[PDB]
Structure formats: structure tokens, C-alpha cells
Design a protein around this nucleic acid. Structure first.
Ligand code: NA
Ligand code: NA
Ligand SMILES: [Zn+2]
Ligand SMILES: [Zn+2]
Length: 327
DNA sequence: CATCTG
DNA sequence: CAGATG
């Protein structure tokens, strides 16, 4: 946690490069365990020979750790840090719609910058284009003050669209955070569940309003359940317009919300812990449900949930306000 | 994972 | 349909 940091950090460096730059999924994958293993490893790694001892770690890496130990830097890492071609990728990747795959391409096409983009605005895809258009805003964090404004508006129309809707903004925003990356809203309806066949409108329904009323400006992907879009708080008294922030609406079966709602809220770590103990009280929980573990090694069967309160209760645990849901 | 692209 | 992205 600070005892074999830089080493973990460079391994990570190496890992990401290989993956995104070249296609070293394996090497990449390697970098990763390695960085994962030294991560837990309780001692002061005073050598590669000592590293290697480790599992996942072998011959190549130790070369590296040693150099980093011996001297304060990695030549190959240093040599990587400069290469424009590497840098372009990691940079283009910065776009909403630009994965390393597309990154790699454009670069080999000369497109290496933001301007390049605009120029060759044709070679971008839709998503790809919006990400460009909102390149900056998209990189802008969302301060709670804005979040509640938004949250408010969302909730009022989901209400109008139909009174039976159960929307819920999760995330850290829910975890009580001061700034959130995007608005990730949970959606269900009574009339939507596990077995209940389809009902796309359940989603498209709302997607309109929000648009209808200018809340949503652009769609990034719109389907029956998931909607990946862009929204905007109506710039008040003209002199200040907000940014375009990312939003995501997902329609879920009423029969498996609070499991999801719970789930999505985080933090990962809270999850893990609740998930381990869950395992203790004789259960398992997942992104959709909670069920009874048969001794046979394992077993199914969905437990019914009317609230986060149902779930907690189950594994017999202190209901934790979402504020105190960090770790 | 669900969506879009080609 | 694989393959990409998020
Ligand atoms: Na990207
Ligand atoms: Na393949
Ligand atoms: Zn030690
Ligand atoms: Zn999100």
C-alpha cells in the first residue's frame, strides 16, 4: 500500500501500454497479476530475486524491478513516455467512442490530435462525434450542487410519464459524494419484471420527456433497456450555460431493483464486504439478486426483495445509510 | 453487458 | 456475425 508502490505503479505502466499500444494482452495480463501480487506482499522488496519469488513474477519483470530499484527509473518506461505514437493513442482514447482499437487506426492514418479529429470529422462515428463535440465538458466533474438540480428534474417527469415509475440516481452521488462523473439513473416499473415479457416503451417513454424538455440533448445509444446519452441543465439567466454531462438510464424488472440499486451504489469495497459476510450468513448476492446457499457446495433460489432493507435483513446486518456505504 | 458498426 | 466501446 506504500511498501511496494512504485513497483506496482510501473508494472501498471507497462501493462496498459502493452495492451492499448501493442496488443500484448498476455504481457499486459502479466503486468497485472504482478502488480497485483506485489500489491498484497507485506514486505520491503529490496530486490528482483526477492520479487521473482513471487508468483506471476518471473524472469522478465524482475529484470525491471531491479533496474527500478538499482536506479530511479525505467529506461523502457522512459523510452515509452516519449514516443509520440504511444502518446497519441492514450490521448485519442480520451474520447467518448475512441477505444484503443480506433486509437491505433487514426494514428496510422495521421490523425493524432483533437484538431485532426475535426478535420477528419467524417471518419468519426456518431458516438465518436459527440465525444469530440463535448470533449471538454465530458472531462468536467459533476459537483453535487448540479447533480441535485438534475436529479430533481429527472424525477419530476418520470413522475409525470407515469406515477408507477421508480427512478433512482445511484453512484457516489447516492454514497453522498461532492462530485460525480456522470448521472447514472436506475429505472423500474411495477409492470416490469423477471418473467414479464418485454416492454420497451417502459424506457423510451421517459427518454422522450427528458428530450422533450431539453434535458437530454443527444443520444449515444438507445435500446430497449439501456440508454446512453447526454444531458443539460438549462442555462439560467444567459451568461452562463452548464456543461453537457453524461447520463444513463436503465430499465430494470421491478422484481430485481434494490439488488441492483444497492449494487450500483457501491463502493465496490462496501460490496465486497457485504458480499463476503453474505456468504457467511449462508448466502450469495449479485448485481440482480440474493439467494440461499445449499450445503451441496452451492445452491439457487431467489429471495424476494422490497428494499435494501430486505437484503440487509437477510444476511442479518446493520442497514447502512448510503452515506456509510464506502468500505 | 448491451449496443452499434460494417 | 465478430468486434468495439463503454
Ligand atoms: Na475512449
Ligand atoms: Na477470434
Ligand atoms: Zn518485510
Ligand atoms: Zn454511468
Amino acid at each position: 500500500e506504500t511498501l511496494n508502490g512504485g513497483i506496482t505503479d510501473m508494472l501498471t505502466e507497462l501493462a496498459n501500454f502493452e495492451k492499448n499500444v501493442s496488443q500484448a494482452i498476455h504481457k499486459y495480463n502479466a503486468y497485472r497479476k504482478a502488480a497485483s501480487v506485489i500489491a498484497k506482499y507485506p514486505h520491503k522488496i529490496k530486490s528482483g530475486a526477492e520479487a521473482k519469488k513471487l508468483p506471476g513474477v518471473g524472469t522478465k519483470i524482475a529484470e525491471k524491478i531491479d533496474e527500478f530499484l538499482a536506479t530511479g527509473k525505467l529506461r523502457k518506461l522512459e523510452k515509452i513516455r516519449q514516443d509520440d505514437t504511444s502518446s497519441s493513442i492514450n490521448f485519442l482514447t480520451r474520447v467518448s467512442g475512441i477505444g484503443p482499437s480506433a486509437a491505433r487506426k487514426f494514428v496510422d492514418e495521421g490523425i493524432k490530435t483533437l484538431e485532426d479529429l475535426r478535420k477528419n470529422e467524417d471518419k468519426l462515428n456518431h458516438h465518436q462525434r459527440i465525444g469530440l463535440k463535448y470533449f471538454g465538458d465530458f472531462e468536467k466533474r459533476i459537483p453535487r450542487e448540479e447533480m441535485l438540480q438534475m436529479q430533481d428534474i429527472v424525477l419530476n417527469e418520470v413522475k409525470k410519464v407515469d406515477s408507477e415509475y421508480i427512478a433512482t440516481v445511484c453512484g457516489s452521488f447516492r454514497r453522498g459524494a461532492e462530485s460525480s462523473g456522470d448521472m447514472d439513473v436506475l429505472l423500474t416499473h411495477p409492470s416490469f419484471t423477471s418473467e414479464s415479457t418485454k416492454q420497451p416503451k417502459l424506457l423510451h417513454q421517459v427518454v422522450e420527456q427528458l428530450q422533450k424538455v431539453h434535458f437530454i440533448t443527444d443520444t449515444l445509444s438507445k435500446g430497449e433497456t439501456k440508454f446512453m446519452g447526454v444531458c443539460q441543465l438549462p442555462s439560467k439567466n444567459d451568461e452562463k450555460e452548464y456543461p453537457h454531462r453524461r447520463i444513463d438510464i436503465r430499465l430494470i424488472p421491478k422484481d430485481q431493483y434494490y439488488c441492483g440499486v444497492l449494487y450500483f451504489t457501491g463502493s465496490d469495497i462496501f460490496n465486497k464486504n457485504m458480499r463476503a459476510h453474505a456468504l457467511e450468513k449462508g448466502f450469495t448476492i449479485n448485481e440482480y439478486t440474493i439467494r440461499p446457499l445449499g450445503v451441496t457446495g452451492v445452491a439457487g433460489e431467489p429471495l424476494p426483495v422490497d428494499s435494501e432493507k430486505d437484503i440487509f435483513d437477510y444476511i442479518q446486518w446493520k442497514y447502512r445509510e448510503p452515506k456509510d456505504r464506502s468500505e
